[PDB]
Design an enzyme around this catalytic site. Structure first.
Site, mmCIF file in Angstrom:
data_model
loop_
_atom_site.group_PDB
_atom_site.id
_atom_site.type_symbol
_atom_site.label_atom_id
_atom_site.label_comp_id
_atom_site.label_asym_id
_atom_site.label_seq_id
_atom_site.Cartn_x
_atom_site.Cartn_y
_atom_site.Cartn_z
ATOM 1 N N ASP A 37 39.475 31.529 47.020
ATOM 2 C CA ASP A 37 40.269 32.126 45.954
ATOM 3 C C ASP A 37 41.727 32.338 46.348
ATOM 4 O OD1 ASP A 37 40.268 34.430 47.614
ATOM 5 O OD2 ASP A 37 39.292 35.709 46.165
ATOM 6 N N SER A 43 42.821 34.331 48.743
ATOM 7 C CA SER A 43 42.903 35.523 49.566
ATOM 8 C C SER A 43 42.614 35.173 51.030
ATOM 9 C CB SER A 43 41.941 36.587 49.031
ATOM 10 O OG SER A 43 40.597 36.280 49.389
ATOM 11 N N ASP A 86 33.712 53.340 49.153
ATOM 12 C CA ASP A 86 33.930 53.060 47.738
ATOM 13 C C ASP A 86 32.645 52.766 46.963
ATOM 14 O OD1 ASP A 86 33.180 50.369 48.183
ATOM 15 O OD2 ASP A 86 34.967 49.565 47.189
#
Ligand SMILES: [Cl-]
Ligand SMILES: [Cl-]
Length: 129
Positions: free
Chosen positions: A48, A50, A101
């Site tokens: 992607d 990244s 998270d």
């Protein structure tokens, strides 16, 4: 810098990672082993666009800014190059935010596939901690 096994365990413990959010120190050493082979300078590019950075292979789409990932959120509010220092403080502080998270350590694919459900305490065995 390429850490030793026990050397890295000691630095991570000092930085508060032992039992952080319920994850014993062996888990964090195991994940560093398979994400980066204990090398703070490791980088890996994803399809992607990244890139993952450092001893814990932290991703540029969400967590740090490398100036070349569109739609990046920079949630740890640091340049990705800070994650490659021989000083692991920036990496550990960011990893604390990641593991908190909601998805715990499943955020790290190598941990899920090569550490989860194994005898991770073998990674700290023999070290003076
Ligand atoms: Cl452990
Ligand atoms: Cl894997």
């Amino acid at each position: 810098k390429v850490f030793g096994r026990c050397e890295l365990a000691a630095a991570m413990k000092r930085h508060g990672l032992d039992n952080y959010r319920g994850y014993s120190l062996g888990n964090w050493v195991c994940a560093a082993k398979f994400e980066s082979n204990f090398n703070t300078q490791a980088t890996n590019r994803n399809t992607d666009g990244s890139t993952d950075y450092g001893i814990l292979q932290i991703n540029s789409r969400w967590w740090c800014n490398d100036g070349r990932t569109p739609g990046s959120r920079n949630l740890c509010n640091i340049p990705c190059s800070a994650l490659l220092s021989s000083d692991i403080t920036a990496s550990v502080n960011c990893a604390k935010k990641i593991v908190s998270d909601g998805n715990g350590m499943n955020a790290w694919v190598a941990w899920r596939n090569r550490c989860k459900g194994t005898d991770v305490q073998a990674w700290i065995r023999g070290c003076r901690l």
